[PDB]
Design a protein around this ligand. Structure first.
Ligand SMILES: Cc1c(Cl)ccc(C(=O)C2=C(O)C(=O)N(C3CC3)[C@@H]2C)c1Cl
Ligand SMILES: Cc1c(Cl)ccc(C(=O)C2=C(O)C(=O)N(C3CC3)[C@@H]2C)c1Cl
Ligand SMILES: [Co+2]
Ligand SMILES: [Co+2]
Lengths: 377, 377
C-alpha cells in the first residue's frame, strides 16, 4: 500500500556530503576505491576562503567532500559577504561534527521542485530547521532540516553545474574512472529509538512506510527516495552492531550508503582489485554452503555460472515476492566502525524499474545464520 | 667545517608522524600515491582504545598516520592504565593540532642511543619539554621536545617491531608496492624568524650549520640528520611562499619532506601514472629552455638520454662543488597550501654516500628565473 502522502514534490537523491578534516585525501581515496571521477571543485582556487569542497561523480551518484580552512582566511567576511559556496557551512559546526563523529555523512540531499516550499512545509510539520532557504545566484535554492543526530536532510531545487561557485575540473585532473556505479539506492540511519525517529521524519516529509536490530524504511511517492532507519535490540548474546555504531559514533548518524551498480560483478571485480592498494575492503565472504543453498532460492533468476560469479566475489543474494537483490558490504570507510558502503543491483519489477525491487536483504540475516551453522557440518 | 658538536649520540631519521582526522583515508591515499606498504598498526583491533595509528614503509622510510578515537572509548583509563601505544598522544592536543594546522607532520622522529639522556641533555640545554621519557615494554624509550610551532622532535632508542603494541599487518592487507623510495633525506620547517629558531634547535642538539626566503640547515655529526629551516623575506614583488605557508598553517610548521629514491626516474614514472587516480600531483614543469641549459651545467654527469628523461618527468637538477642533485616537488599533500613532498636522488660524494651530497637545490631559484625569462624569448 502506497498512500503517496508526500507533503511536497520530491524528485531524486541529489548528492551525499561528507564532512572531513582534509577533503583532498578522502576524495582521492574514494575516487580510486569506487571508480568515481573528479568533476567539480570549490576551494581557494575558485575564490572560496571558507571551505574546500570536491565533488566525485559516477553516473548519477554525487559524493561531495568538504573540510574547513583556517577561520582566519575569512575572518573579515560576514554572511552577506561570504565566499563560501555552500551558505549553510559553518567552521564550528564542521569541526564539532568531525571531532564528535569522525568521518561521516553530514547531508543527505534530495532534489525537490521548490526548496523554499519544502523547507516551509517541513518546518510547519515539525521539522527542526538547520539552515533556512538561500537562493544561489538566482538559480539554485538550498535549505536544510535536521534528519537524525547531526545529519541534515538537504533540499535543493533548480529554476532551470552542481552549485553556483563550483567549477568543472580540468580534464587533466579528471581521469574517467568508472566501475559501473550509477546512483544512490538508499541511505540508512542508526538511531537509539526507531519509533520517535520514524514519527519525526515521516511527520515532516509525508514519506510512507515501505539479529540485533529493528528497522523500517520511509519512502517518497514513487519510492525512489528510500531512507531505512535502524534501532538496536538490547540484551542479545552477541552485542548489537547498531549499539556499537552509536557508541563509536557518539550517537545517531548515517550507517550505510547503498550504491546501485549497472553490473555488480564488474563493480566488485574492480573494487576488489584495489582493496589492498588504496581502495575499500569488503566484509568476510559467506561460507560455500551459502552458495550451495542459492540454487534452491534463486536458481530461476541466475544461472549456475552467474551464481559461481557471486561466490567468487562474495556477493549476497536476497529475494522478496517482486524481485531479486544482489548486495555486498564494505568494511567501515574510515577509522571508526561506523559508516560503510553497500553495493547493490536489483533484478525484476520492470514497468523503468520500480524502487526497492527485491527489498533490502533482511532475508540474508537468517540465511547467513543457517549457512554458517550448516557449514560447520 | 664540521665541528661534530652533537650533545648526544644521534643515529638516523626513524619515522615521520602525521596527525590526521581519519588516519585510514590518509594512509591509503599515501600508500597508493607513494608506493609504500602497510606494515604495522595500532588501533581498536590491537586493543588501542585511544588512537588509530597506521605505519607505511618504503625501504627505510617510515610514515605513521594517527587520528584520535572518541574520548569516550577510553574515559575510564588513566595514564598508568592507558591502552594508547604512543604514550605522548593526547586527544585534545591532536584535535587542536588538526583544527589549527590541518593535515601535517606532528613528529620528526630520530633514533638515538639513549632517549632519556637525549631528553635530559636537550632540556638542560634549552629544549622545551613536550613529553617526558617513557619506557615501552622495557624495550623502547620515547621522549619528545618542541622543535618549532606544534612540531616535536621525537627521540626513540631501542635496548636491542616498530613500537611495542603495534602489530605487523596481515599479508593479505599488505600489498608490496614499491616505487623506489628508500629513506628520508631531510625535513624542512617554515618559521617567522630564522635566527631564534636556529639558536634554539642548535642550542639543545649541538647540530651544526651545514627568492622570498632565507634558509639554513642544521646537521648531526655525520650529517645524515638534516633539518633545513626557512623564514620569509618580506616586501618582494611576489609575496613569499613562506609567508603564505605561515598564514594558511596558522604559524610555524613542517614545510616539506624530502624522500630519497634509488631511481628517481622510476619513482616519478610510477607516481605520475597515479596522479589523477588517487595519488599526488607535481608542481608545473620548468620550460624546455631549462633542459636546454642543462647540457652546460651537468653535461658531464648525465647523458643526453638521461637529461631527456629528466625533461619528460619535469625533474630539476642542481650541483654544488661536491655532487649533483636531482629533485622535484609535489603539489601540497592536502587541502591547504602548506606541506608538500620532494623526491630526490643524489650523485657523487662516495667514500657509502656522504650526507647532503649536492646541497638542497638553491641554485634552482636563479636558474628557473633565468630559464623562464629566456624561454619567453
Ligand atoms: C549486514 C546486512 C545484511 Cl546481512 C543484509 C541487509 C543489510 C542492509 O543493507 C539493510 C538495509 O538497507 C535495511 O533496510 N535493512 C533492514 C532489515 C530490513 C538491512 C539492515 C545489511 Cl547492512
Ligand atoms: C621550490 C624549491 C626549489 Cl626551486 C629548489 C630547492 C627547494 C628545497 O627543497 C629547499 C631545501 O630543502 C632547502 O634547504 N632550501 C634552501 C635554499 C637553501 C630549499 C628551499 C625548493 Cl622547496
Ligand atoms: Co542496505
Ligand atoms: Co628540499
Amino acid at each position: 500500500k502506497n498512500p503517496k502522502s508526500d507533503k511536497f514534490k520530491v524528485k531524486r537523491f541529489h548528492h551525499i556530503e561528507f564532512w572531513c578534516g582534509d577533503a583532498t585525501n578522502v576524495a582521492r581515496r574514494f575516487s580510486w576505491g569506487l571508480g568515481m571521477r573528479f568533476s567539480a571543485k570549490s576551494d581557494l582556487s575558485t575564490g572560496n576562503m571558507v571551505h574546500a569542497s570536491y565533488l566525485l561523480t559516477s553516473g548519477d551518484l554525487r559524493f561531495l567532500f568538504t573540510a574547513p580552512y583556517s577561520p582566519s582566511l575569512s575572518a573579515g567576511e560576514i554572511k552577506p559577504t561570504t565566499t563560501a559556496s555552500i551558505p549553510s557551512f559553518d567552521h564550528g559546526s564542521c569541526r564539532s561534527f568531525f571531532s564528535s563523529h569522525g568521518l561521516g555523512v553530514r547531508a543527505v540531499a534530495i532534489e525537490v521542485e521548490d526548496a523554499e516550499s519544502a523547507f516551509s512545509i517541513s518546518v510547519a510539520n515539525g521539522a527542526i530547521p538547520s539552515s533556512p532557504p538561500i537562493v544561489l545566484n538566482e538559480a539554485v535554492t538550498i535549505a536544510e532540516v535536521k534528519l537524525y543526530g547531526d545529519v541534515v536532510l538537504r533540499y535543493v531545487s533548480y529554476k532551470a553545474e552542481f552549485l553556483p561557485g563550483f567549477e568543472r575540473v580540468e580534464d587533466a585532473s579528471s581521469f574517467p574512472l568508472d566501475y559501473g556505479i550509477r546512483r544512490l539506492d538508499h541511505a540508512v540511519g542508526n538511531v537509539p529509538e526507531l519509533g520517535p525517529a520514524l514519527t519525526y521524519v515521516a511527520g515532516f516529509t509525508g514519506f510512507h512506510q515501505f539479529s540485533g536490530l529493528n528497522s523500517a524504511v520511509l519512502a517518497s511517492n514513487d519510492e525512489m527516495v528510500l531512507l531505512p532507519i535502524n534501532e538496536p535490540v538490547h540484551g542479545t548474546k552477541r552485542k548489537s552492531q547498531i549499539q556499537t555504531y552509536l557508541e563509536h559514533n557518539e550517537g545517531a548518524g548515517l550507517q550505510h550508503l547503498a550504491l546501485m551498480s549497472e553490473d555488480i560483478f564488474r563493480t566488485l571485480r574492480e573494487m576488489r582489485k584495489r582493496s589492498s592498494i588504496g581502495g575499500f575492503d569488503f566484509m568476510p565472504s559467506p561460507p560455500p554452503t551459502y552458495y550451495q543453498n542459492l540454487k534452491k532460492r534463486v536458481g530461476d533468476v541466475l544461472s549456475d555460472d552467474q551464481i559461481k560469479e557471486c561466490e567468487e566475489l562474495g556477493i549476497l543474494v536476497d529475494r522478496d515476492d517482486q524481485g531479486t537483490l544482489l548486495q555486498i558490504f564494505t568494511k567501515p570507510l574510515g577509522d571508526r566502525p561506523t559508516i560503510f558502503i553497500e553495493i547493490i543491483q536489483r533484478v525484476g519489477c520492470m514497468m523503468y524499474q520500480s524502487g526497492g525491487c527485491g527489498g533490502f536483504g533482511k532475508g540474508n540475516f537468517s540465511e547467513l545464520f543457517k549457512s554458517i551453522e550448516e557449514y560447520e557440518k
